[model samples]
Target: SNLNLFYTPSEIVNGKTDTGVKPEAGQRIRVGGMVTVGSMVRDPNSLHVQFAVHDSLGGEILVTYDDLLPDLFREGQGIVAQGVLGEDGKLAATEVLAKHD
Candidate 1:
């Protein structure tokens, strides 16, 4: 179910009130938010991409993916990243979904 698969940046960072548990490292989950402006950093020698996602409430999280991003992926765009949470608190994304205009 989507409720178990989808989470907000805030819910992933801060513990959700329902469960009062933050996402643990290595847990595979999907988080959705707006791409923070000027937060994207791409590797010149590889497909590696790093960026931050933020919710309207100012909660944010870092995401890293070693693959081509969606054509519509860009700062300020809404997106959902699915991956495993890393020890450093970043999401090592396997797939990224960008919202259509």
Candidate 2:
């Protein structure tokens, strides 16, 4: 449980609700937000997928996942993702949960 942490895009990108502490790349954390519209993409040659999660404040984080996405995953849906930040500044998702309104 040493790596358990939760964050929103505002706290991470805009630094709104955090303690002024920033999560460095490679930190394992959980983040939830509305999936940005028109940002989901899949690699035709590989299992890789890419998307962006955005907060109400308009802060967005780029995320990449290499696996099957939830059947309900879609643009403009609310989602919670858990993963590590890559050195390239994208969230390398290990898991994703998509939800309805």
Candidate 3:
């Protein structure tokens, strides 16, 4: 079976639909937003990293990743992260890519 979801960053944050459908907690979702300024945190002892992304609608989601990022990756930049929503209420990103200018 194939199930995919497409959502803007605001939709994910709002978590409700005009049609009354709410997104599940643990589903894989795609979120697009600008990386929040001063939100990148790198682990000094490991590859782990965390950051925040914000949508124009004032929605924000925390993202945790433990891998290499594109050279262009930086705060106040745009990116789309694909991953499962974490139980801890953050996005556990499996893949992240830099958005084009």
Question: Highest lDDT, which number?
Answer: 1
Model 2 worst lDDT run, 10 consecutive residues: 13-22
- Candidate 1 lDDT over 3-100, as tens digits, reads 32877876566654223365466567888888877878888855778887778777777778888777735786778888876645677886887753
Give one digit per residue, the lDDT tens place, for model 2 in 1-101: 54866678655665422223466665788878787778788888557787877887767877778886786367877888888776446668868866555
Candidate 3: misplaced stretches above 4 Å?
1-6, 16-21
The residue pairs that clash in candidate 3, if any, are: none
Worst 10 residues of 3 by lDDT: 15-24
Q: How many residue-pair clashes does candidate 2 contain? A: 0
Please, what are the lDDT tens digits per residue for candidate 3 over residues 31-52? 7778777878888855777777
List the RMSD of every prediction in angstroms.
3.8, 3.5, 3.6
The parts of candidate 2 lying over 4 Å away from their true place are: 15-21
Ordered by lDDT, highest first, the candidates read 1, 2, 3
**Better by TM-score, candidate 3 or 1:** 1
